Design a protein around this ligand. Structure first.
Ligand SMILES: [K+]
Ligand SMILES: [K+]
Ligand SMILES: [K+]
Ligand SMILES: [Mg+2]
Ligand SMILES: [Mg+2]
Length: 136
RNA sequence: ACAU
DNA sequence: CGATGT
């Protein structure tokens, strides 16, 4: 329908999938970058999209903000709703860091509360989410 | 199929 | 063209 401009938008960026994963959150209205995660050497697109939403939840909660979060990831929105990131990525020494962060994000969700609406960014209608990395 |  | 996901 209408974009809710008073919101936080998040997105993953990667070099390969699986590959190097990062994410960022921006003010939907202004494009101001509000947070950026240091690149993680191996992860998946969906793991990064999940981490980005959870980081957004933590960021808004710390600031007493009731703004919604936009994500373009059907998968990550569902994983956050379920409090469970159902990634297929093998757990081995190479993937230990991303899996540690995902495990810690799930743990945060299981021990905290939030009312933040997590909304699907409608890329087909509105173009690329404002947190997009411009790499595609 | 749809969403990345 | 390849991959991650419901
Ligand atoms: K997109
Ligand atoms: K991109
Ligand atoms: K597929
Ligand atoms: Mg995305
Ligand atoms: Mg993007």
């Amino acid at each position: 329908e209408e974009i809710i401009w008073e919101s936080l938008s998040v997105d993953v960026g990667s070099q390969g999938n699986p590959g190097i994963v990062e994410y960022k959150g921006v003010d939907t209205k202004t494009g101001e970058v509000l947070f950026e995660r240091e690149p993680i050497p191996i992860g998946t697109n969906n793991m990064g999209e999940f981490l980005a939403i959870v980081h957004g939840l933590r960021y808004l909660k710390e600031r007493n903000s009731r703004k919604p979060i936009y994500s373009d990831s059907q998968t990550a929105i569902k994983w956050v709703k379920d409090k469970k990131a159902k990634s297929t990525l093998v757990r081995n020494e190479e993937t230990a860091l991303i899996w540690k962060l995902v495990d810690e994000a799930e743990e945060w969700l299981n021990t905290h509360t939030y009312e933040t609406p997590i909304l699907k960014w409608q890329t087909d209608k509105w173009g690329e989410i404002k947190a997009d990395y411009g790499r595609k």
